[PDB]
């Protein structure tokens, strides 16, 4: 605090942190001291060290049952480091832990913006099977639907279909002036570079989401139809399909010269195709046979 510290002074305390971890056990005060240096490490600008010392904090968890409530307020410092560079998914599960601080509140504005902060990262996170059941835990809550933008958010997820992206900007472009709560848009659009990266992120998510229904419904499509469907040039569609094909999330062959493009159908020349298809379909009426049998058997014994 004397010289306000710098890259070197913050490094002097670094090597001294772990000296007393194994020396003695201190419940509260030590924890408060061990989080003091990373908030200076943000000013050091060196992140690779900040994540190491932050990796020493997780082995101290779970810190609950002591403090309660202060250390729950420190997660607000950790999300700052995780949200910064490479991971949008690392804040996903941790913002549900920063959602436990307004649980004790006794506060409305902080809590009301906690809900939007926890609900809006679904788009920023790349789609995964863990995300699917993640959003279902928060859905159905009694406090969550209080936000009208939440109904738009949910509408894009449930059963997909299609929507105009500019009309999406009609709902999400008002939230900058709207509020009440401007904090989520303060994180997104606060930095011009951050906001632009999440604009291209939202675009990547909606165009990736339009694709996965096309993957189930094709069969085939004309190339020029996908351009007017996604409201972008065919060159942009080429870029998009290049990243989707290298992600090998869905196999496709999209011919540009002849205009015929399609996702799947999988080849399956002979064996497995006819096997599973023909046989299981035939077993349908076979296993259902005995099922309706007893249905008529009970109906005829009810009246006779």
């Amino acid at each position: 605090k004397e010289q306000n510290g710098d890259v070197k002074e913050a490094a002097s305390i670094l090597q001294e942190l772990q000296v007393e971890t194994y020396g003695s056990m201190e419940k509260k005060e030590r924890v408060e001291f061990i989080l003091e240096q990373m908030r200076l490490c943000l000013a050091v600008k060196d992140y690779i060290r900040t994540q190491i010392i932050s990796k020493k904090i997780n082995t101290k968890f779970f810190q609950e049952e002591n403090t309660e409530k202060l250390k729950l307020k420190y997660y607000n410092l950790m999300i700052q480091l995780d949200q910064h560079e490479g991971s949008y998914l690392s804040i996903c599960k941790h913002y549900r832990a920063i959602y436990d601080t307004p649980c004790i509140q006794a506060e409305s504005e902080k809590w009301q913006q906690a809900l939007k902060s926890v609900v809006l990262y679904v788009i920023l996170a790349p789609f995964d099977n863990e995300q699917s059941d993640l959003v279902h835990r928060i859905s159905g809550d009694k406090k969550l639907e209080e936000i009208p933008k939440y109904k738009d958010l949910l509408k894009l997820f449930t059963t997909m279909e299609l929507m105009r992206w500019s009309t999406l900007v009609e709902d999400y472009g008002m939230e900058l002036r709207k509020g009440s709560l401007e904090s989520p848009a303060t994180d997104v659009f606060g930095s011009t570079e951050e906001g632009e990266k999440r604009w291209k992120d939202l675009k990547n998510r909606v165009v990736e989401h339009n694709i996965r229904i096309m993957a189930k419904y094709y069969t085939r499509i004309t190339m020029k139809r996908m351009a007017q469907l996604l409201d972008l040039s065919v060159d942009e569609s080429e870029a998009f399909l290049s990243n989707l094909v290298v992600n090998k999330t869905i196999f496709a062959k999209v011919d540009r010269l002849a205009g015929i493009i399609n996702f799947q159908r999988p080849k399956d020349p002979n064996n497995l195709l006819n096997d599973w298809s023909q046989k299981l379909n035939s077993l349908m009426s076979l296993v259902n046979k005995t099922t309706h049998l007893i249905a008529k058997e009970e109906m005829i014994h009810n009246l006779q």
């Binding site: 290049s242 290298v246 496709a252 062959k253 540009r256 010269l257 493009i261």
Partner: protein
């Protein structure tokens, strides 16, 4: 070290060639820094010769490579990163600033022509994988190359 150089000109064995440079660095360690900093260039480059860029980052991430980190280890990491990303434009952009470290390569023609012959199909596997039927003229615009040698290289890929 010399065993490594001769094996690099022989090109017969690309495995033990990395072993010799590794042991040589173990000798140069803790005594002479100038030999230790120049020893990593050959081992990592020979691992790029083996077309395994993923292990390069793992070697430079250890505590032993952090003390010896410098302007050369970033030139090794950028070749590993361009081979992993499979982009010749990034490779050439970084090739100008690191040319000072590229001149120390005893043979600049071998490694660069073999890597170019490699990155050719590493750029082709991105354009070919999405669709089977492809025109030559529009796909040659991505790699920015005449269609003649391209068709020659593709037919070679069939062979």
């Amino acid at each position: 070290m010399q065993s490594g150089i001769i094996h690099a000109a022989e090109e017969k064995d690309w495995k033990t060639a990395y072993s010799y440079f590794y042991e040589a660095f173990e000798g140069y360690d803790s005594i002479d820094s100038p030999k230790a900093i120049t020893s990593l260039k050959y081992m990592l480059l020979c691992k790029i010769m083996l077309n395994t860029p993923e292990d390069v980052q793992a070697l430079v991430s250890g505590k032993l490579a952090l003390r010896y980190a410098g302007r050369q280890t970033e030139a090794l990491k950028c070749v590993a990163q361009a081979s992993k990303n499979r982009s010749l434009a990034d490779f050439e952009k970084a090739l100008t600033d690191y040319r000072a470290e590229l001149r120390d390569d005893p043979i600049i023609s071998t490694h660069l022509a073999k890597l170019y012959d490699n990155l050719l199909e590493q750029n082709l596997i991105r354009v070919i994988e999405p669709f089977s039927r492809v025109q030559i003229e529009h796909i040659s615009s991505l790699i920015k190359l005449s269609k003649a040698d391209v068709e020659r290289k593709l037919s070679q890929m069939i062979l």
